[PDB]
């Protein structure tokens, strides 16, 4: 059916990168407005980055200039690489595609911890 | 960059009523919006987006309303299971942007 | 007569020249207007869709010998031109520059345009064609050459010596 | 019209002004790169491309070189080494209704980037899967064309701001557009440094009595001397006579 599933979570020393990873079914990712978005234990959630289908891409101005969104077209996958993992970075980190006024985010994925050493 | 209010911060109501939440809006948000229901342990779901628009499958109990910086959702009569966290999202600024709200945990009795 | 056409190519793929004349005005056009297989005898019009880049419109260029001469070097298409009155008479008369059109189409091939009156217009016909009056025009070819002009008190010329012709005239 | 296939005229074969052009009074936002605007004004080429259409006012900062977003980058998008202006005038009051002057639906759904002055107009259904909403209903049925919903209540950032943008071709250019004004009073019989239409030189200007020929605009005397020279605005011919020098 139609989901999105996530990997890449886990625990990595302050400073240090980790890879996320994000693949989807039943629908193609390509051609759909991908997103990242975080969610600190306990808070809100806050847009992180998303990719177009053009390969424009965008971050939130938090991460700007250390996350780079990146996609497997071939799989119908998208990844996030992240480096320097400071102490905030510690989050359940969601993927969706996001339709916009034709529908607000609806499929969401199923989340990945991301807490440090310390 | 329009920062969103949400109240009350709780709420407890009698099985069987209606149940009243209002977010507010710093800009204009007139038709930009989403309401998220993340029942604890999972990922929010997508209620009703843009101005009162009901997402596919979502209970027609659900009703949206307000315009401009203030809007408001209403539960008909709210069951066991409607106990969650909810948030009003805008996207006044689609390519790229977001902004979400502080939630509101939703129980009863 | 009536008008020329100038160009490459009588198909669309290049920009070819028009030039039309008429008893109210001359129409002057570049849009790469694709021919048939002959050119329209003026039923007003007879080529393909258009692109044109540039347009221009004036006054018409009207026993009476007519004389033309196309020139076309500087990226600019040169016309000059004179009408006396009277085969070719052996009297003497020189040309004035009529106009300096600046369009930089690469001209290398050139026909003529007709006309009649009441004439049917078909995109191909036979050699069998439609009358006409008695008529007839001339065709001669430039080539690079050394003349040696006189004028005279008026500013006009009046006689010309072909440098290259026989051993006195050099 | 709409930013989805934008409104195009090709200027030539004029003199350009520009005295209206950044110098009007309603303009709102004007800057060229590469070319200075007084230069500009006098600066003449081979054609001028017009562009007009609306757009909101939170997406003028698109329209840049190479600048990505999305109206510059699946609707409408402009060369890296694009030389020419563009302008944006606040059209808070000209194109818009408090039922929404949204008549124009810009494109935001697109399957690759465009290329520099693409025009790009098309009604089809973006999608996902196999079928668009012609057969299927949810899933899979995006529709590129969005309304704007255009009303007074909108703030800036959604007002509707009217775009030109004027792009100067200068390739084999026989140009044909050059407007500069530029022509002084003439002084006579006076040591003047003249400059008639091109024709520069120094001398004593005298009324003529030579017949120039309406097509002749220069005369000669013998040894390639420019001796006379017709007036381009009141066509009188005028006589040159180098002031007197000498051995003393
Ligand atoms: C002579 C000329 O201008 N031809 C072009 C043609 O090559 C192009 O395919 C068409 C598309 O707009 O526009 C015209
Ligand atoms: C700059 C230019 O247009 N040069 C043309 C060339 O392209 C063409 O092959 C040749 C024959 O017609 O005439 C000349
Ligand atoms: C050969 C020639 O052109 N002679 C002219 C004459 O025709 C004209 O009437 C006169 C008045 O300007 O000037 C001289």
Redesign the pocket.
């Known amino acids: 059916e139609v989901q999105l599933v996530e990997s890449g979570g886990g625990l990595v020393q302050p400073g240090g990168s980790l890879r996320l990873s994000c693949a989807a079914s039943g629908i193609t990712v390509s051609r759909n407005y991908m997103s990242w978005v975080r969610q600190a234990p306990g808070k809100g959630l806050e847009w992180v980055s998303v990719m177009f289908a053009g390969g424009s891409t965008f971050y939130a101005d938090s991460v700007k200039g250390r996350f780079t969104i990146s996609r497997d077209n071939s799989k119908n996958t998208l990844y996030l690489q992240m480096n320097s993992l400071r102490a905030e970075d510690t989050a359940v980190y969601y993927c969706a595609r996001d339709l916009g006024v034709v529908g607000a985010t609806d499929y969401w994925g199923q989340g990945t911890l991301v807490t440090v050493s310390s | 960059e329009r920062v969103m209010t949400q109240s009350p911060a709780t709420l407890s109501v009698s099985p069987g009523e209606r149940a009243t939440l209002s977010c507010r809006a710093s800009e204009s948000v007139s038709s930009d919006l989403a309401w998220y229901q993340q029942k604890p342990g999972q990922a929010p779901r997508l209620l009703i987006y843009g101005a009162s628009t009901r997402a596919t499958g979502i209970p027609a109990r659900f009703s949206g309303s307000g315009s401009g910086t203030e809007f408001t959702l209403t539960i008909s009569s709210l069951q066991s299971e409607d106990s969650a966290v909810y948030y009003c999202q805008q996207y006044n600024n689609w390519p790229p942007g977001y902004t979400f709200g502080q939630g509101t945990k939703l129980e009863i009795k | 007569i009536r008008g020329w056409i100038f160009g490459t190519t009588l198909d669309?793929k290049t920009?070819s020249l028009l030039i039309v004349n008429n008893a109210t005005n001359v129409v002057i056009k570049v849009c790469?207007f694709q021919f048939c297989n002959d050119p329209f005898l003026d039923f007003r019009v007879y080529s393909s869709a258009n692109?044109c880049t540039f347009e221009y419109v004036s006054q018409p260029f009207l026993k009476n010998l007519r004389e033309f001469v196309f020139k076309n070097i500087d990226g600019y298409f040169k016309i000059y031109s004179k009408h006396t009155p009277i085969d070719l008479p052996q009297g003497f008369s020189a040309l004035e520059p009529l106009v300096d059109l600046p369009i930089g189409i690469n001209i290398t091939r050139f026909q003529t345009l007709l006309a009649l009156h009441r004439s049917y217009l078909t995109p191909g016909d036979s050699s069998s064609g439609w009358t006409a009056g008695a008529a007839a025009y001339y065709v001669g070819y430039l080539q690079p050459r050394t003349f040696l002009l006189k004028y005279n008190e008026n500013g006009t010329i009046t006689d010309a010596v072909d440098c290259a012709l026989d051993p006195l005239s050099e | 019209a709409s930013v989805y296939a934008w409104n195009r005229k090709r200027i030539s074969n004029c003199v350009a002004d520009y005295s209206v052009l950044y110098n009007f009074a309603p303009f709102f936002a004007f800057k060229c790169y590469g070319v200075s605007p007084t230069k500009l004004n006098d600066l003449c080429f081979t054609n001028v491309y017009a562009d007009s259409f609306v757009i909101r006012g939170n997406e003028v900062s698109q329209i840049a070189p190479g600048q990505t977003g999305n109206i510059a980058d699946y609707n409408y998008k402009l060369p890296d080494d694009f030389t020419g202006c563009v302008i944006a005038w606040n059209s808070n009051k000209l194109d818009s209704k408090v039922g929404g002057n949204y008549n124009y639906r810009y494109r935001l759904f697109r399957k690759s980037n465009l290329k520099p002055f693409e025009r790009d107009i098309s009604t089809e259904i973006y999608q996902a899967g196999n079928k668009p909403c012609n057969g299927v209903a949810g899933v899979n049925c995006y529709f590129p064309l969005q309304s704007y919903g255009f009303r007074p209540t909108y703030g800036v950032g959604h007002q509707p701001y009217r775009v030109v943008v004027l792009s100067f071709e200068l390739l084999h250019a026989p140009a044909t557009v050059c407007g500069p004004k530029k022509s002084t009073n003439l002084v006579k019989n006076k040591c003047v440094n003249f400059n008639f239409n091109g024709l520069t030189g120094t001398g004593v200007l005298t009324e003529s009595n030579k017949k120039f020929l309406p097509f002749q605009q220069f005369g000669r005397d013998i040894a390639d001397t420019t001796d006379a020279v017709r007036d381009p605005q009141t066509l009188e011919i005028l006589d040159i006579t180098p002031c007197s020098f000498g051995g003393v």
């Open positions: 669309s920009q790469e692109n």
